[PDB]
Every structure is written in C-alpha cells, then in structure tokens.
C-alpha cells in the first residue's frame, strides 16, 4: 500500500501546525514568573497556561476542527488539554536525567520540582513512567503529531454534542496513522496498538491531575497563583 | 496641645503596619513576570496584584477595620485599593527623573512604560501631576500612613453598610492627623487642607483608571494577562 493524497495532506498540515505551535528553543520561558526552589507553582502555572495557548493554535489547524461548533471545540479542548500537554511535553523529556529539559538548568524540571507546585507522587510517578514508555516508542514526527490530534478528537469526552462528526474525524485520522506506520515505519507492527494504549494511559493521568488540581484550586491562597486561562480551561463551568 | 495616649497608639500601630507591608528593597519584584519594552501589561499586573495584597495586610492592621463585617471590609477595599496604591507608590516616585524607581533600571517605570500596559495619557498625566504635588508636600511617615488609612476608611464608597461606624473611624483618624500636624509639624497650617484635597484628586484618578481598566478587561486577549486577584478586586461583582 501507499497513502492517498488526502492522507498525505493531513500529515502535512498537521506537522506544519506542530512547528508553528512549538518553539524548540523555549526562549519564551524567560517571560514566565521565575522558577523557585509551593515555590514552583507560579512558574508552572505560567508554563501550562502558555502550553494551553499552543495546544489551542494546534487544534485550530487540525483539518475539520475549525468546522465544529464552538461549544464542541471548547468541550474537546477543556477535557483533552492536559493530555495534549503531557503528550507534547515528551519532546523536552530526557531519559538521561529523567526530567523535562527546556534550554537550561533553571528550566529543567524533575519530579521534585513539580512537587513544589502542589502535586503528589501519585500523579508524577505514573507520569514519568508514561513519558519513558512513550519516549521508548521512538515515534516519528508524523506519528507524534497524529497521536495528539487523535487525542484531541476523541468523541468520548464530557460535553461533546456532535459525537457522530467527531468520530468520523478521529477515524479518518486513525486510518492515516495505521496506514503511515504500515508503509513508512519499519518494525512497527505492534506500534499502533502501543500508541492506542498510550491514549488509555493518558485518561488515567487526566483523572489524577484533575483530582489534584481540584484540591489545589479549592484553596484561594493557591488558586490566586494560577492564571485566568488555566482557571477557565481546567475549571468546571458549563 | 499634645496628642493623647490613644492617638499616639494609633500612629504607632499604623506606622508599624506600614513597615510590615512595604519592602523598601523591592527585591520581590524579580518574582514578577518580567518587564518588556502591550508588552508591559504582564509585569504591571503582577506589580499591582502584589500591591493589593500589601494594601490588604495594611488595612488588616488599621485599628477598627478588622472589627467591621467582611462585606464592608471588601467594599472599602474594592473601591479604595487603587487609591492606596497611588498613594503608597509615592514612596518610590522620584522628581529627578519623574518616574517610579524600584531598585534598578528595569524596575524604573516612566509614563511611556505604563502606556505599554494599556493606559492612556488621560490617566498618566494627572497621575504624575498628582505624585509631584504629593511629593512636594514633604509628608512625614506618620502623615503619609495616616492619609492612606483615611482613604481606606472613607464611608462614601459604593457598597458600605455601616457608614455610621466607618465615619466614626475616619473622624477619629482625621483628628489624629489634624492634631499631629498642629503639634509635630512646623510650617504646616495649610497642610491638612492640602492633604484633604489630595484625597479629592484621588477620586478623579480612581474614575479614570476604572474607565481604562474596564476598557482593558473587556478584551479577553488582555484580561487573560491579568491576575485572579486583580480581576476580583477591580472587577464589578456584588
């Protein structure tokens, strides 16, 4: 087999969208509230808020997303956001020092750093285990970006309305991945399954984060250190 | 005449409260989102949000404030906050370079800096004219701190309920000032009047800021750069 022109286009517009919303230099991080070693909460809130905007710009360039109703777009984004963030953050994750390295020693976050931002080992341990497994799948750019769009276009989210249209989108995308791997990836005949499972892991991870963020956001002394966008996206308004 | 022990105490607890809520080193400013030359909006929002917390800690130590109902305390704070900020900010204002200098060249804000945070000359011009006049009154520490507490305890604010109790507080404080000046300040027999007028100027200034903040906060691209506390205090919820 070989991919169709339509499939090929999808890959193209997706990879372009990724490059336009991911700055490999992390130079913008100097505009965040500085890291402090809940001393790390201001910087990581600034980090997540930044990533949410990037995740939004990415989604806007996914073929078909823009053509959903705003309600649905917000619904998909509000529930998949942290998963896209965990997914995209694999690019900065490093196995050699088991942390996310972002252009410097100040912007290197280990588990202990994130523990000073109000999270527990109950999240951070499966998260790092997740990032390693995902790292070990040695995904192509095309695969990485596909997987993220698949995650965005999951129809089993709370709040979606046109589940029929969103499922059609996700399937179209999965075919592109299942195909791509078959043709363009040597030695990956279990990979699709391995990626699908990575999605199932993200749901658990989403749940644990949501528990902990809920704990965090319920204390005004801490939620005041969050950002209006974070509060909007991770908050529970209908 | 000479001040009573009660008046003397009031002065004492007020000056102590000022020192506890004003860090003359401005070292905490390195924890704000950096200044950029609406490039200055993130840093000044971080600056104001910081000052609001200090203004709150100050008010908490004013004799009698703590004994009001929370409703009233919030009402007094929500409407006087920016005035206390303009008032307290005189301490960093400098006539030699016509700007607020806060420990460095990065933390030196002229009119042009604040114009990059979403404000117009319509505010910033009378503001600087205000800061100069106030600077020229060469207030004692005791007078400066009194004037701020008077401003906080104004009963003519929207939302106050026990205007009777708050007026009693403010008068008690004004007597302390009117007295202090008489006794402890040589050559200030017009000063009380000059300070009272400074209060009337602040109301105009409050109005102009409120117009402009309302303009600013109505644009999501800008309000997202503000902070949860700023939004709470300067926002209009009842």
């Amino acid at each position: 087999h070989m991919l169709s022109d339509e499939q090929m286009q999808i890959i193209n517009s997706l990879v372009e969208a990724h490059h336009k919303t991911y700055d490999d230099s992390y130079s913008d991080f100097v505009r965040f509230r500085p890291p402090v070693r809940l001393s790390m909460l201001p910087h990581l809130a600034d980090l997540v808020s930044y990533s949410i905007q990037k995740v939004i710009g990415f989604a806007k360039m996914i073929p078909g997303f823009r053509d959903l109703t705003a309600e649905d777009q917000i619904a998909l984004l509000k529930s998949s956001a942290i998963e896209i963030i965990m997914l995209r953050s694999n690019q900065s994750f490093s196995l050699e020092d088991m942390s996310w390295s972002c252009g410097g020693p100040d912007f290197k976050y280990c588990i202990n750093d994130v523990t000073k931002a109000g999270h527990t080992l109950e999240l951070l341990e499966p998260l790092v285990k997740f990032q390693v497994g995902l790292k070990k799948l040695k995904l192509h750019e095309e695969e990485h970006v596909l997987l993220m769009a698949i995650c965005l276009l999951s129809p089993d989210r709370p709040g979606v309305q046109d589940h029929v249209r969103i499922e059609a989108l996700q399937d179209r995308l999965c075919d592109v991945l299942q195909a791509y791997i078959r043709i363009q990836h040597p030695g990956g005949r279990l990979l699709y399954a391995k990626m699908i499972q990575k999605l199932a892991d993200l749901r658990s991870l989403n749940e644990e984060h949501s528990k902990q963020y809920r704990s965090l956001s319920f204390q005004p002394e801490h939620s005041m250190q969050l950002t209006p966008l974070v509060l909007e996206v991770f908050g529970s308004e209908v | 005449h000479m001040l009573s022990d009660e008046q003397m105490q009031i002065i004492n607890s007020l000056v102590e409260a000022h020192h506890k809520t004003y860090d003359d080193s401005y070292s905490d400013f390195v924890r704000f989102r950096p200044p950029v030359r609406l490039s200055m909006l993130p840093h000044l929002a971080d600056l104001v949000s910081y000052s609001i917390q200090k203004v709150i800690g100050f008010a908490k130590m004013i004799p009698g404030f703590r004994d009001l109902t929370a409703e009233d305390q919030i009402a007094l704070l929500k409407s006087s906050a920016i005035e206390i900020i303009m008032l307290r900010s005189n301490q960093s204002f400098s006539l030699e370079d016509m700007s607020w200098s806060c420990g460095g060249p990065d933390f030196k804000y002229c009119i042009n800096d604040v114009t990059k945070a979403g404000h117009t000359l319509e505010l910033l011009e009378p503001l600087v004219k205000f800061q100069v006049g106030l600077k020229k009154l060469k207030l004692h520490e005791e007078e400066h701190v009194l004037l701020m507490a008077i401003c906080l305890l104004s009963p003519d604010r929207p939302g106050v309920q026990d205007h009777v109790r708050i007026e009693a507080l403010q008068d008690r404080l004004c007597d302390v000032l009117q007295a202090y000046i008489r006794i402890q300040h040589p050559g200030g027999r017009l000063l009380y009047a000059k300070m009272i007028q400074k209060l009337a100027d602040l109301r105009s200034l409050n109005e102009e800021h409120s117009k402009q903040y309302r303009s600013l906060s109505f644009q999501p691209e800008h309000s997202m750069q503000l902070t949860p506390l700023v939004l709470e205090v300067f926002g209009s919820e009842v």
């Binding site: 984004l77 209006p228 | 997202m224």
Partner: peptide, 10 residues
Amino acid sequence: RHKILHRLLQ
C-alpha cells in the same frame, strides 16, 4: 461562559 477560549478560537 469561557470568554478567553472563545477569543483564542478567533
């Protein structure tokens, strides 16, 4: 609600 998300979604 979601004032910011609506804007960011242009």
